[PDB]
Structure formats: structure tokens, C-alpha cells
Amino acid sequence: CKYDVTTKVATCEIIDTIDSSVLKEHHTVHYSITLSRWDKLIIKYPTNEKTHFENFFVNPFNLKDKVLYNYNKPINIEHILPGAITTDIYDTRTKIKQYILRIPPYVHKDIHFSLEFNNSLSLTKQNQNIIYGNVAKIFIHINQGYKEIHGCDFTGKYSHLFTYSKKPLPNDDDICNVTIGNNTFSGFACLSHFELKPNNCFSSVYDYNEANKVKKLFDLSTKVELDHIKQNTSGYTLSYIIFNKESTKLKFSCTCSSNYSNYTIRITFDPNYIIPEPQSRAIIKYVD
């Protein structure tokens, strides 16, 4: 695995590590990488239909919703690390699969988990010699996050993450107004049963300078970094936004609407606004 701090990406390639067509000097690779908040992790692995890769199975079986937490029991990634974003792309052009995990902007506590890719069961014959494969184990250590993401949690369950966690109620109409500056994490979390207006926030947002007109964040700005998922294991949609080295001030919004409730989040970007948050942060530790 290689870490890049400019793009904040940790890449773990195992295509040539557990290959069954060659001989390796190590039975298993025990690599533990300590991630942080907002740390993309990319793993490219083979598929079930490729050369000398018949016996290739993954622990956990599904790489979307489950991650191995303790011993050999896969627990939901959302359950252990709330707000995590998982993408699994299966490319049949080269018979590969890319798995991308994005850590939430804030981690409430130290988190440990692991993944396994087993190809040792794959067998081959070369020069009248029996050649086995190998297995790969990746240990992931998550560091504690910094402060809290200054957004709004309409879900009522992401209280640790955001600074506005209001439980949903029948006929609920809440307006969220949060102002953030550069290098400040913001976002929202709504119910997946609702409608996100406009679709794909923050990829497209309502502009409060254009009278709630639909615009795209790419047109609004270029040096911003965002992410969004529509439905997690527990069934909530999330979106995160970060402004980096932007000298423009603006205001945008998103809405989560239904037949009985209508939540909205209105975010103001000001390059010359620093959050009047105390310098020290509450340090949480578990001692017994």
C-alpha cells in the first residue's frame, strides 16, 4: 500500500500479491495502514472470471455493506463507522474490481477493522510442478477525528457527526442555516425514503443567489471536494462538502421532501469567516 498526502489516498494493490501463476516469498502480507478522517482507500482486486483466478473469495463476502470487525464476524460498515461511503466498481474490460472506502469527516472514536482476499485455494501446474496461490490480509486503523462536521442531521441519528441532530416528527418543517469557510467540512443526512431536491446533492444544488434555481457544483466552483451516497445499510442518504482555497462567497441549499415533511439545509460559504469554536476539543477516552 502507498499513501499520497496531496490527494489523501491510500492505495492497496493485491493483483500481483496473491497471484497463483507465480511463486511468492511470503505466505501472507500483514500490512496495517492507519487512516484518518476523510481518507480515501482504494483497493484493486481480481474478479471471479480471469486467468488462474478461479478460487478467489473475499472475507467479507460482500464488499459494499459489510466489513470484518472482530475475529471473523463481518459487521456493517455503517454500524461501526457511521457515515462511511463505499463504492464497488466491477469492470469487465480488464476483469477487475475497484473498492473505494471514504472515511467520514469525523470519527468519534478509534476504530479497527480488517479485510481478507484469499486466492491460495487457486492451483496451477507449471513445468510439472504444482504451484499454489496466497492470501492477503489488510488491517485498517482509524484515528480519532477533529471536532465535528458543521452540517445538519435531519436523520436524528447522526448526533455525533453533525451539530444539528433533530429527530423527525409528523408534519415537520425545519430550516437549517450553517455558514462555513475554507477547509471546513459540512453536509447533510436525510432519510432515503425522501426526495432530494435537486437530485444528487451536492453534485447539483439549489442556488440561493439564483432564487433556488438548479445548478451544478462543478459550474459553481472547481476546487471543492464533495461526496454523496443515496442509501446506506441503515437507509439514510448522506452528502459531505469541503471548500479548499476558494476566494468566493456564496449560498446554496438542498431539500429533503416527502408527503408529510420537508427539511431543508442552507449553507453559506464565506472565505473570510472562521468558526468561533474553542481551540481545545473534548477528548473522549474509555478507561476501565
Place this chain on the structure above:
Amino acid sequence: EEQLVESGGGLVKPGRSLRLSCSASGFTLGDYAVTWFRQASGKEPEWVGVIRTKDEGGTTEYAASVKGRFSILRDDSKSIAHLQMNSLKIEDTAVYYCTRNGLRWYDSSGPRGWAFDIWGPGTLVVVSS
């Protein structure tokens, strides 16, 4: 849901003694100072009495118009408040509420402010002839 319900109101001749009762459902009344307000002829609620927390001694306060007659009692064991009325004048006909100080805030000088959140429906008390 936390709420308050009151009873004991009705029609009573002037110069008698009445007993309004208030009770809290869904929580405990021992952590809140019960303030008995009244409203007459579609006016703003007017302070009638206040009974304070056990931690604050248990002092009772009353407005000038009713000072020396009305007596407030509490039972934290049953979480029930009572307003005992002695020699009601004609002007006591009104609807009475038993609010609780849901929001409180203090400072170095002691108690500083109360804001009431939960109001009972209110008991109508009428005195005439």
C-alpha cells in the same frame, strides 16, 4: 408525552374556600417550581402564586392582590400541586393554569430566570351570586 392536568375548579359562592389541584403526567414535578397563573376576560396570564424547588428551601411567593390568602402546597411523592383559596372575592373568576419552569438559568448571584414550557388545560373558577 409529558403534560399537566388540573381539576377542582367550578362554581362557588363568595367567601368560601376552594382547592385547585394540578398533576404532572409523564415526568416528575420535584425538579420544577410550580407557578400558578390565572387568566380572566381574555387578558394575559397574571401571576397568582409560585412554589419553588425543594433545593431552594420551598419558599412561596404571591402577588399583592392575593397575598395572605392563597396557599400553595406540593407533594413530590405523588408529584401533585395544590392551590388553597381562602375567602374568594368576586374578582377570582378566571381560568387557572399550573405552569412549570421547563427552562431555567442561574449565575453567581443565584437563580436568575425561568421560562415555562408545559401548561395544563386550565380550571375555570367562577364566584358570584
Place this chain on the structure above:
Amino acid sequence: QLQLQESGPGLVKPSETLSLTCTVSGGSISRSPYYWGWIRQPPGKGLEWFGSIYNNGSTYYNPPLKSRLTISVDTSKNQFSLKLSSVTAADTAVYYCARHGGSTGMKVVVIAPPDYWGQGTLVTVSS
């Protein structure tokens, strides 16, 4: 293209001193964070290290060889010299000047292998 050129006597009488001077060409020593030292190779043998002194005038020697050798930089001519007294019949060797970084114990230091060696001069102690 830094270069080190040795200079000194090709033969000395036994029980005497030994003075050599290395001249640096191409670069300079006044503004270098690199230490400059001496390495001795007797014929048919490996290499033995003989001290090093910083440009401003520090002193570091071999722990069993702090009694006789002295080393001095002259920045004006961009040279540095080694004087080793009380030569012995087993002190014949070729002397290489090395430009190498410091140790790991100092507060601020450069750590590097000895690069840009000198050509080497032969010093003999015979009858």
C-alpha cells in the same frame, strides 16, 4: 564537480611526523555542512578511518587515535591538512581524502557516505 587532490611526502624517516594536505577543487569548504576526513589503506589490506574535522574547526578522531593526529581546514586556500606524529614501520599506506557526513549523535548533522574520494598518495616508513 568537486574533486579532492592529495599532497605530501612520499617517504619519511621512522619515528617522525607525517604532514599531508588535501586541496578541494570545483566546490568550496567555507559553506559546506559536510565533514572532511582521512582514510588509510596499507597495501594488501582494507581501509582504516582517520578522523574528520568540520569546516569551522571542530575535532573528531578515532577513539584509539586521539593522541597524535591533528587536522586543520584553511578556507582561504580551500584545503585541509592532517599531521600524524610518531610514525611506525607499519604506517606505510595510501591516504584517501573523503568528503562524508557527520554521525547520528549531534543535534544538527548531515549523514552521507564518503563520496568524491581523492586519488591517493603513498607514504612509506622504511629503513
Place this chain on the structure above:
Amino acid sequence: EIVMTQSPATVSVSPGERATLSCRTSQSVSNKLAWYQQKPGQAPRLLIYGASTRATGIPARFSGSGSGTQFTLTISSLQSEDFAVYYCQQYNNWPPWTFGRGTKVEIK
């Protein structure tokens, strides 16, 4: 004790249009105000505390603003269920048990 003044006593506005109610306090109270709404036939309920924070189970159209001696409660896009009387009580300095004159919102 402090006395709060509300003017006008009656506010007329058509449904779907915001109405503004103002509460002026004689002394300095900072940002400790409470707005109560009372619909006819039932007790008043706590609508806003802190002069800017909405109580639980309150639609966002009830906006509170102001500080010091002047405060304002704006009702935006008034519906048919937002006709009541509003009282402002100051709870910064003792005693807190003092309500305003009451302001009524009617249909134009």
C-alpha cells in the same frame, strides 16, 4: 420587575403573507425572551425561547429575532391555523413571571 409593550394590539394580514409582531422592553434583557402562542379555547404554549430558538414541534415559519430591548416574531406564509394571541415574557432578571399585553393576529 420589567414591563413589555406590544404594538399594535391587533395585526391584520391575509393568509399566505408574513406578519410582524414587535415586543419592546423598557430595560435591558439581552437575549432572554419567551414568546407564547395561545389559540382561543386552550392554554398558551411555549413557542420561542431565547428570542431566536424555536421550541420543539414548531414549524420553521415562526421566526424570532431581536436582542436587548427590542424583539420581533415574524410569521412567514401564515396558514389558517396560525391565528392566536402572542405574549412576550422577559426572564433575564428576577422576576420572570410577567407577560406582555398580548397581540392578536386576524384575517384581512
Place this chain on the structure above:
Amino acid sequence: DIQMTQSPATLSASVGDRVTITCRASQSISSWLAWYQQKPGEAPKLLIYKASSLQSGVPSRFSGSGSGTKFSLTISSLQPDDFATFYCQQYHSYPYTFGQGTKLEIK
């Protein structure tokens, strides 16, 4: 004083072979070590400037493999002009210690 040794004593190999030379350190010198080759009568040359690294200006045949106590330098293929004597050194703390060295000759 850190003591370094080079193994084995002498090397005899034919052209086009791959040979590994081992180096042992008395103490922990981290990853600080240098591999030198010297032709008879000439000044030594810095083949490898750090364990598991290569110096600029050298053919890619030589490969460094070492960290900690044991170190190794591997030559893949051989050339007629590869006859020399080798020198393992530690540039970690004064004094500088050099290995005994191996002899590379064509046969």
C-alpha cells in the same frame, strides 16, 4: 565501535552470472550503509549509497537488498571490466568502519 564484516572472502564466477555478497554489522546502524568497488590501484567508487538503493551513474545490474543487521548486494550478469575489490561501510556514527572485502575476477 561498530564492526562490519563482508562475506564470503573471495569470489570466482563466470561471465553472465548473478552473485550475492553479504554484509554483517555489529550494532544497529538503521539503513545507513554504502557499497564500494575499487579497481587495483584506483580510488574506490560509491556503487550503492544506501541499503536497497542505487547510485546515479551506475548500470542497473547491481541491486541493493538490506535493512537492519544483514545486508546484501546482488550482481545480475557479469562484465569483463567487473574485476575489483568490494567494500561494505556504515556511515552512521564515527568512526567509519569498512568491511574486509571480496575479490571479483573473471573466470
Place this chain on the structure above:
Amino acid sequence: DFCKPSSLNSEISGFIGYKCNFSNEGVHNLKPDMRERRSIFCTIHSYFIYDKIRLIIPKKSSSPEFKILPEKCFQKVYTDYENRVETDISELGLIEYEIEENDTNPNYNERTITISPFSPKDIEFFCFCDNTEKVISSIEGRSAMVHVRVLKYPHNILFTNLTNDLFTYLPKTYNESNFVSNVLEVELNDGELFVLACELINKKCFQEGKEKALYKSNKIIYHKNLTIFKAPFYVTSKDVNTECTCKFKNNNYKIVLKPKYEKKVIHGCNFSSNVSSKHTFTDSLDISLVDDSAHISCNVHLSEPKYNHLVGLNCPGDIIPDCFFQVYQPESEELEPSNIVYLDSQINIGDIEYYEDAEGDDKIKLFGIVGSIPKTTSFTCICKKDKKSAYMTVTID
């Protein structure tokens, strides 16, 4: 555009404080569970500039097993870990603190305490949350404790008394009579609070000085007609000013803040070839002038019972990790460091004052510390240029 200072904080739907959540529905719950079997500590050891500490608790009716010691926490507070003696917080030496107890929400009870930076001593107080009464499936509950250490502000606090009210709680001030032509120019050291008192101030008060360039306070805290300007921990130039305006008594009283001394000797390493840099570092070792086969290693050792100085690093290459927000670990003689930790948790001291600059291509990163470090610590940062690397290792006692 004169508006009251309390009106310059705008409005925010968030909290912006020391939230110590302890609620069953919250993430840091206290009901019995099999995943975690240990108590939760919410330790906050730092000085507060009118800052808030919140202690969310579950409602009594919903979770009758939950109890809090003392029951009226932040009104009465424990004073000892072992003696368990509850004392009124009014007699703890606190100045201008206040408490709010919000119970309107039907899910949790909020208890906030607002603390001022005017305390004359270092105060410590605990508040315990016992949930061992709740037992589910023969599993006892977990406890919790909020420890708050209000450190006395380690620098001189100044006050401008430009209001009619009398502030007997803090007696060091300048008052109206010290103004010359309604213009004040105070010379302050680093980290020197200036708590100006004014009912009406400028909309952009303490944000734009009258010429003489301009510098930024790390904080401009508006609270109850009090504008707090926190003097910066590190300054580079002399011609520096910051302006505020008032209309008190129908007079435009102007206030001008300006530090006097500049450019402390930064305890760090200067890897840049620039010898005319406006910064002054203890050490120096060029990275561009050394050859590719050289590893640069420099160490900065600091030893003092109390610290007021800085640690910095100036280099023309890339800096790994993003120092000094994040640093490496003391990984020596094994391998190059590859694990990232936060400096705040690495040194175990709060409110560290960071600083960044880009002098041409030279990236300069600094962090200044005021106070006493609990335990001796060390950390490393790496600067890489081309293929050469320089390791700066700080060892703070």
C-alpha cells in the same frame, strides 16, 4: 452601521461548544452493551474565552436508572476524585460564569455552563454520571465523568471601560479617562487579551486597522457588550495596527491595537537556502546544497518547566504530513515514519497556536505552545525535495 457586540455573532443552528453527550439515543450512550464495557471520560483541560460546556443527559422519566452527581451539576460540583465533596461553584473562584438548564426538548436534558477568561486561579471540577442502576441481561451499566480544568489565562488580561456600568469583578482596566482625543493605542505582548467594553461598536470592529498593514486575531469573541481581541502568538512586522470604533457619549472613541516586539527565535530547522528570510530559526541546514546521497537529520530539544515559545520548520520541498496540524511518531532506527497523529493528542496539551506561511516557494509551518506539557514527548516531520529527505525531530520535555 453600529450594532451591539452580541448582535455581531449572526445566527447558527449548530452548537459551537464543548458538547459532552451522554444520552441513550446518542452515539456515546451509557446503557449496557456488549461492544463496549468501560466508562466514558469527557476531559476538557484548557482556558475558556467565554466558552460553553454542555452536558446532555437522558430525561428522568425515560431512563429513571440514570443519575447524575451532583444532581444539580454545574450548580454544585465535586472537588475531589477520592474525597467526593460537592461544593457550590459560586465559591470556586469563578468569575462571571453562568448556567442554563434546558428541559423543553422531549428527548434529552441540556445543561450548559458558560465560563469567562477572567478567573484568577486554576479551577478544577468534576461531574459524574452514574448509570450502573440500569441492568439488562444481567449486565451492569457504564458510568461517565466530565472533568473540566479552567486554567487561568497565562497572559495579562486588559480591559477598556467605555461603558457606564461598573465592572467590579475584574479591576485591571484603562477606563475612559486614559483616551487621548478618543484614540487609544495599547502595546500588547503575544496572547494578550483585550476585552473592550462597549454597547455600540463598528460592524467590522477589530478587523481593519488604520493603515500600517493589518493582522488577524486568532479570535474575536463578542459576548454581552464585550469584544475580546486575542493578541496573536507570532508576528513578523512592526507596522501593525487594528482599529475599532465606538459612539459612546456621542463621541467616536477609536481603539488601536498594536504589538511591539517581533520575530521570536523559533526553535526549529531552516532547510531553505534563503538567508534573508523574515523568520529566525535556531538551526540551519541547506537541503538544496547537499547531494542526493545524503539524508538530513536535525533535532530540536526543549526543556523548561513552563513554555511560551514555538517550534517551526521552513523548507522548499513538500512537507509530510501536513505539519504542524498532523505529525509523525517517534519511529527511529526501525523505518521511516508512516503513521499520522494529531499534534494536540501527540503533545497532550490543548489550545496550541498553529501558523503557516509561503515565502516564495518556501513552505514554513509553526506551532507555538504556552503552558506546561504533562509528559515529555517527541515527534518528527519530514521535508522531501527531489529524492533528498530531511527529518526534523522535536523533543519537548
